């Protein structure tokens, strides 16, 4: 019914392109670049969009005269003429009004602090349906316009700016309080047997499409976690339930638990993730066997107590296994009697850590793949890369337990293959002594003594 602060939302606008409507949800990866976008998330059933990084909470939500008296030095419902705060739940920054640009319009992305009036965002009704000082109701359309520059929220073109043109906006519920304990949607976990299920590490002959139940120092690294997708955007945090399909998606890599016809069980590009080949459920029995709610809905998995099998949902087929700990994971038709797994939950820097090293991984092997490019030819994200590799050196600074963070951090990332990663950046850079543009070799010392400096940093201690 209502909008608190302390639900997570996400923003979404819609654009009629090919005569059909296109939803899309403001999103932003914050390191490595500060600039929301937008993800299309009407063609869900083919393609899971990337949600993780659409997700915002609602900090703050003010009167005018309750903001400029915070200026000058509680789960309350959202009313219309109310300043709201919206922090990102991955990179927990700020969406904020930039000033930068590309004439009247502004940059829409985040920033690293909630000081001063370019992240607060008045909210206002888009009929005489609603007026100031009444609550914000899930379903409305809704006008957002800065506290700081005082342009709209503003669909542009498929991109986001703030402007003077309007743009109607659902801020649609992902979740609000859940049962204490209890799995829900869009949840970063692991899943245990008896050892959990993981890929094999980076660099492996797999090209790490293959699933395994594995023990040992794995149950702490980034490679096993995996990030459960009910197949919904709205209310897609809300609790989990026996036998509703679901999609999991492997954090680090980005691919989608998978049955497919060739391979059997393995893991997929998005791309390739439509519904029959990637739902799965949590069943209570492997017994022979609702309508989804506009809610939180009933908690009914537990972590650490629930014994959960896991099914294909299409097939009908059981997760299970076949043959320093390392099975096989594959699906049949009959499994094991000790088949039932049970769930932890990952931990917030544990989990961030993971979907860095997803976005790093990608930008950097793009930035690989550029200069592989024009490497035999005499005639890129340097911006990115630049930010990126900034970011990540202030991400390891040395600090007072600290240290801990910082070598558990650094750890993450080395398992990943982040240190390879780094280098073969230095060594591609390094072929050239002093091809690519000039505008981008105006970058390359820059570039490759922030290479240096991260490598240095995640051997640092």
């Given at each position: 019914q209502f909008l608190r602060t302390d639900d997570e939302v996400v923003l979404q606008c819609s654009a009629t392109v090919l005569k059909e409507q296109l939803k899309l949800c403001?999103?932003?990866?914050?390191?490595?670049?500060?600039?929301?976008?937008?993800?299309?998330?009407?063609?869900?059933?083919?393609?899971?969009?990337?949600?993780?990084?659409?997700?915002?909470?609602?900090?703050?939500?003010?009167?005018?005269?309750?903001?400029?008296?915070?200026?000058?030095?509680?789960?309350?419902?959202?009313?219309?003429?109310?300043?709201?705060?919206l922090r990102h739940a991955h990179s927990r920054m700020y969406l904020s009004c930039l000033t930068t640009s590309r004439k009247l319009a502004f940059d829409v992305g985040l920033q690293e602090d909630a000081t001063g009036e370019?992240?607060?965002?008045?909210?206002?009704?888009?009929?005489?349906?609603?007026?100031?000082?009444?609550?914000?109701?899930?379903?409305?359309?809704?006008?957002?316009?800065?506290?700081?520059?005082?342009?709209?929220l503003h669909l542009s073109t498929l991109q986001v700016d703030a402007s003077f043109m309007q743009t109607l906006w659902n801020m649609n519920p992902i979740c609000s309080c859940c049962e204490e304990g209890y799995v829900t949607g869009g949840h970063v976990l692991?899943?245990?047997?008896?050892?959990?299920?993981?890929?094999?590490?980076?660099?492996?002959?797999?090209?790490?499409?293959?699933?395994?139940?594995?023990?040992?120092?794995?149950?702490?690294?980034?490679?096993?976690?995996?990030?459960?997708?009910?197949?919904?955007?709205?209310?897609?945090?809300?609790?989990?339930?026996?036998?509703?399909?679901?999609?999991?998606?492997?954090?680090?890599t980005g691919r989608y638990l998978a049955l497919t016809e060739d391979q059997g069980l393995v893991v997929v590009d998005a791309c390739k993730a439509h519904t029959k080949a990637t739902s799965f459920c949590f069943r209570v029995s492997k017994e022979?066997?609702?309508?989804?709610?506009?809610?939180?809905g009933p908690p009914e998995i537990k972590y650490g107590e629930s014994l959960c099998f896991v099914q294909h949902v299409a097939s009908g087929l059981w997760l299970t296994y076949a043959a320093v700990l390392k099975k096989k994971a594959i699906l049949?038709?009959?499994?094991?009697?000790?088949?039932?797994?049970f769930l932890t939950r990952?931990?917030?820097?544990?989990?961030?850590?993971?979907?860095?090293?997803?976005?790093?991984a990608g930008l950097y092997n793009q930035f690989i793949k550029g200069l592989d490019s024009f490497s035999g030819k005499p005639r890129?994200?340097?911006?990115?890369?630049?930010?990126?590799?900034?970011?990540?050196?202030?991400?390891?600074?040395?600090?007072?337990?600290?240290?801990?963070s910082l070598r558990?951090?650094?750890?993450?990332?080395?398992?990943?293959?982040?240190?390879?990663?780094?280098?073969?950046?230095?060594?591609?850079?390094?072929?050239?002594?002093?091809?690519?543009?000039?505008?981008?070799?105006?970058?390359?010392?820059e570039i490759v003594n922030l290479l240096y400096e991260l490598l240095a940093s995640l051997i640092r201690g």
């Open positions: 403001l999103a932003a990866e914050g390191f490595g670049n500060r600039l929301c976008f937008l993800e299309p998330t009407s063609n869900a059933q083919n393609v899971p969009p990337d949600l993780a990084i659409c997700c915002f909470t609602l900090e703050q939500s003010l009167s005018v005269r309750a903001l400029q008296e915070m200026l000058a030095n509680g789960h309350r419902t959202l009313l219309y003429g109310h300043a709201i705060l370019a992240c607060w965002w008045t909210m206002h009704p888009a009929s005489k349906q609603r007026s100031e000082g009444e609550k914000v109701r899930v379903g409305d359309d809704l006008i957002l316009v800065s506290v700081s520059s005082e342009r709209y692991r899943l245990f047997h008896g050892e959990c299920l993981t890929i094999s590490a980076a660099d492996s002959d797999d090209q790490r499409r293959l699933v395994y139940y594995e023990g040992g120092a794995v149950c702490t690294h980034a490679r096993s976690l995996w990030r459960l997708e009910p197949l919904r955007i709205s209310w897609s945090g809300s609790h989990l339930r026996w036998g509703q399909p679901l999609r999991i998606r492997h954090v680090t022979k066997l609702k309508r989804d709610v506009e809610g939180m049949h038709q009959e499994g094991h009697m000790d088949d039932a797994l990952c931990q917030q820097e544990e989990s961030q850590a993971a979907r860095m090293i997803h976005s790093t890129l994200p340097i911006e990115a890369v630049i930010l990126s590799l900034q970011d990540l050196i202030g991400y390891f600074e040395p600090p007072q337990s600290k240290l801990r558990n951090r650094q750890s993450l990332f080395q398992e990943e293959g982040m240190l390879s990663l780094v280098l073969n950046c230095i060594d591609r850079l390094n072929v050239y002594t002093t091809y690519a543009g000039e505008e981008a070799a105006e970058s390359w010392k």
